[model samples]
Target chain A: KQYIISEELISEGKWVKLEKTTYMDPTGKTRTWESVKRTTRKEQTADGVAVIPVLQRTLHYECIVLVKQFRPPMGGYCIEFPAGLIDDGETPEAAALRELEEETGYKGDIAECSPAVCMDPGLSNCTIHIVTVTINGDDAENARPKPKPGDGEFVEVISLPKNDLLQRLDALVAEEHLTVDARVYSYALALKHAN
Target chain B: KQYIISEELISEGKWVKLEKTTYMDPTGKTRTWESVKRTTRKEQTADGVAVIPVLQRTLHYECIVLVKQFRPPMGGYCIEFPAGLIDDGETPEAAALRELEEETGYKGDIAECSPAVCMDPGLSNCTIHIVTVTINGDDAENARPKPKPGDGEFVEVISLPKNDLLQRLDALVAEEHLTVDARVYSYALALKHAN
Candidate 1:
């Protein structure tokens, strides 16, 4: 279905581009949908995004590593899974492993991953592949914490136990400490699924 | 936190903007971060992104609606939750209900919603608030499908059954119908949480 007839780049900044696209819908309707693309300077090699969904368990699956950062666009601090862009040459697997260490210094083994998923198709073309990471027991010393996020980032590392994720988020919200990431919050719901 | 010293818009296209932010990190380090922002020009009110996450127990917990479209930026059909921006003076709940009808022509009751969550903290300040939507049941004629989406949008709607999620997704991928949206996929992981 060659519904997308053509697309033109309307504007560009450093990492984002506004695109004008003309496409035919299911009913043979042709319309223009303005959208965005987040990419690097290189043309041939497209940039990809990946993530490390680290889980730790003492009594329960409570350890979730999250990074809190002050985002300028929303003028606030955001709590999210440890994630980053997988450069043009790297596989999301390698990128996830590398980012997990670079961002948190915690070493983990990727038991597996959910195939790539689109973040927000309507807003922009950003796909994120989240790798489920458990503390790599083989390298016992891999649990060491890191110093700081590379790339001149000012990020605070926080861990939330899955059992108390929602309550913890509520307490943090009361103190204006952090806003819960949706995925992290949803995991809590799924925890109560079977009962 | 007034840690946000200042903000300057680098570029503005039709919907989103490229902004340069000057803010103080937690370590009291002053840093400039480049971020992309999505906002509305009608008023000072910021444009908020939102979703209606609908789940039901028909044999298994299935989903309500998802959209499939040709996102030119990625040059592919992306499957994502029916989402949109919260225009000026609109509460997220209102936006979710209205967008649900406008986008999918489905009437649902907003059971609850999560506070805003930052989708990508590193790239831009894009926050999304998710509403849990349930299909209207009482009306005998409620499940009728519509032929088109409002706002001149061209999207195909997909409802997923949780029991067959992965298989369904794999089949779609094999035939290239669509890729699963990450958060929606995460919800499945959550669906398997504790009993």
Candidate 2:
């Protein structure tokens, strides 16, 4: 593997920026590629955190928590795991809980956290931590959760039975013509595959 | 849910572009957001295809084919599924087969296909179809495959047992300090989850 020789700034946006980098390939050829980057990415913290909340009911039935919101980039509403950019100096686990509670109104205990993972390495320098959270459905507050989306944020909460999430998500997306986030889609597929 | 009022081009690059979109949210609030878009997206066709190659061996062992290459955007080597952009007028299945042959030298039968799925909805408008391809390891050509990557493409093929793909991938990534493509990582995680 070769390394980059130089990178030149191509364009800068409000939250994202574009850069062109000149790099040497394994065959000794110098090539240039363009990449988008999030301006707020910090070196010591993850760019964002996506929570995969598993709610265990009194009868032992498990459900997955999701959120639907208008994503301007998609030009429509998108079904995705409750996720958000991490606040400065916040850990990924902390960000996951905060975003989950704000968007879905569920207090969850941290289950597991994935290693830092790239979001779209082909186009951007963005990365996120996929955090799994366990929610006790018997909790009083969990029985009647109230979402508190931030200003300008209009989120709808969705709870899919853990066993039939993939099928339900597929049907819902097809019926409503809604966009599905890649991470959420992959998770659903993975659940099916593992089963 | 609301619709976008207008989009203003902020910057244009070779293959990607940035834009500022003005849209009305569910609360009737006029808002502006930035989005990254692929310039070459054609209607009625997917932007790219990712193949999940399932290789069936004589002993009945199933394996998944992956590719490792230096992705300029990631600034390092990334392990990913065999994938490529679709040519104009080409079908997603056709692109999957072609990329599979070129990147891994494996002839595969298309088992199933996913609907157009967004790659990173939060960042760009790029979408891809995930195709499941089944390969017969008994074929003569498959006995000793030869990859034919295009000009300037340097890809290394990897075959991991399907049952243990996730574990192997995790170990390999950690040992080599290589980056994992989000799709591949998600697929592995999904496989584990399903099981």
Candidate 3:
């Protein structure tokens, strides 16, 4: 059975509640999270089960791996894949196309669509629906976008052949360029489909 | 060069500060994060260099799994190893051992400690060290210690054979048991080292 505990209004904007719960595990233990619920009528759960903020939209998109310099939290600049939060009311497929155009300046069709999961679950519950979009090498080169100055973000979209992607993942692990979560998932999905 | 932002004391427990930042992408988009500094410290480095508080603590650790829960964020719990934050003044090795014990209840010797790197170089400025440990069936069964509930939370441990672990990951993906980060990283690591 599920049990609910104390609830509190968090921030000035949203009302959040804390729930203490126990699930029947082989080992008896309690798992807990401060469940945040938006009390405003503006909130909507598409179905009774899933809650999506009225202001937020869902989109399926692709992450364009651009080797760009980024200052990581631990410190120092490094390269990363470019990703954006999907716009409100956009399909994941549409979001992928839009993001590719906006971020990389590449207009391409999605070659394939695959389900992806979020990297962090404890803090945010969201899934990434990855749509593989392929653009011609020439188009990619010519379509590179110039980001606004002071944006502090620039990206070099480099395309790796499928095999090379695998190799890069390996190299990332060896060089510690990949995190435990990202490296493992990418490798697993690739090998599972032999992509 | 490194820069530091001095903490401004506000009221009895709050503080404020300003700082410059480097480590932008090619477009010059700087990564951002909320800061919480426990104490006031001296400001160092030149203006525009990002400076924040530094806390000294023990090594952090996470559980590594051949197969664990799938996270939706990654699309499916692909594959993941378990992990956790290290306590203050703890050695990386010790933290690894402790996390393994706490998460999986598998007490085993740490075989190797890889060099640490920023898990997410773009967003977080934290370093994570990976330590590999080996566990046998007997060790797994005996590893569970007396339950020490923290924050009203208890632990649940599941032991599976290597092959079964892989299958479980797949099954979890199908059943939506894994998170995105867990699925991706766990799957990649599992595939990379698989015999």
Candidate 4:
């Protein structure tokens, strides 16, 4: 294995950007790779953060917070965990809490966090921090909370029993024609494997 | 929420392309969204496939097959599952097996398959089918196998005990300074949650 010798910008867009990299293999053969990047990536540790909000009503009644929103790229509604880009100097933990509250109307404590993970490593330079947030559903404010999404953001929150999250998501796809985010689906599968 | 009214191309690159979508909100206000898409996407079910290769050496000894390679987009090496783009009209299961053997030199059976899952839904329209592969390490063909990755792809095969995948990945990051792919990290986390 060898390292990239040089990288060059190919094109830039408002949100999406393209670049090219030249590298050499162990045999001294040179090659090129085309890669995508985010133009808004800041000096922060990560470009975005996704929160796995676990709502605990009781020991036996835990739920996971999700959102249904139309994604232009997918050309359909996607069920995803509450996520947002990190503000310039903000920490991933802070962004996770803020995004979770804005999208799902739940205030939660950070339960755990994963290191920055690449979403589409082969195609893009996008990375996100996965934050596990524990929400107290017994709290008064959380009982009937309302979300205030930003302008142009039409997000619908869905809270499903954590144990049956995968089933519920499949049902949504079958009935409402919704799609599930990979992270959310992988998490549900993980819970099943754990159990 | 409303559906997309129209979509217009913003820019196109060899691999990465950008588009702008216009849609009306629930409040009847129109807005635009910039989205990214892969230019080489075909009419197949998905754009790519990833294999979770489980090497069963014995009832007590199991390992997960992973690849360590330099990702040009991430500007560093990433620990990821054996994955490849789906050939046009090829089934995800077939692609998974082929890529697995090409990258790790293991003939695997498709134990399970996940429906197409969206990766980076908010950013790109890329989707992949995750196939769970089971490999019998005692088989004659599996002993002392060798990989045959394509030209310019310098991938190193790694087999780690299934029980301590996360810990091993963490150790790799600490010792070798390699980043873990989000899907691989998520799968490891899922295994931990399952246990």
Top of the candidates by TM-score: 2
Query: What's the number of clashes in each of the models?
Result: 2, 5, 70, 3
Q: For model 3, how does the per-residue alpha-carbon lDDT over A8-67 read when each residue is reduced to its tens digit?
A: 322222221212222332235433332212223132211011000011112422122444
lDDT of 4 at B73: 82
Candidate 4 per-residue lDDT, tens place, B5-55, comes to 898988777877878888776788888888888889878888998888989
lDDT string for model 2 (B102-128, tens) is 999999898877777778777877888
Give per-residue CA lDDT, model 1, range B27-112, as digits (tens): 67777767776654444332454554465544456564677766655567777677777777887788888877776777778877
Supply DockQ values for each candidate.
0.51, 0.71, 0.17, 0.66
Q: By the TM-score metric, which is better: model 1 or model 3?
A: 1
Alpha-carbon error at B47 in model 2, in Å? 1.1
> Candidate 1, after superposition: displacement of residue B96 in Å?
1.8
TM-score of chain B of 3: 0.53
Error at A123, model 1, angstroms: 2.3
Number of residue pairs clashing in candidate 3, backbone atoms closer than 3 angstroms, sequence gap of 3 or more or interchain: 70
- Across A126-147, the per-residue lDDT of candidate 2 in tens digits comes to 7788888999999897889988
Ranking by DockQ: 2, 4, 1, 3
Q: Tell me chain A's TM-score in each of the predictions.
A: 0.84, 0.97, 0.54, 0.95
Assign candidate 1 its CAPRI class.
Answer: medium
Clash pairs, candidate 4, are A193-B194, A194-B193, A194-B194
- Please give, as one word, the docking class of candidate 3: incorrect
Off by over 4 Å in 3: A1-64, A71-76, A105-116, A124-152, A157-195, B1-80, B109-127, B138-151, B158-195
TM-score of each: 0.84, 0.96, 0.53, 0.94
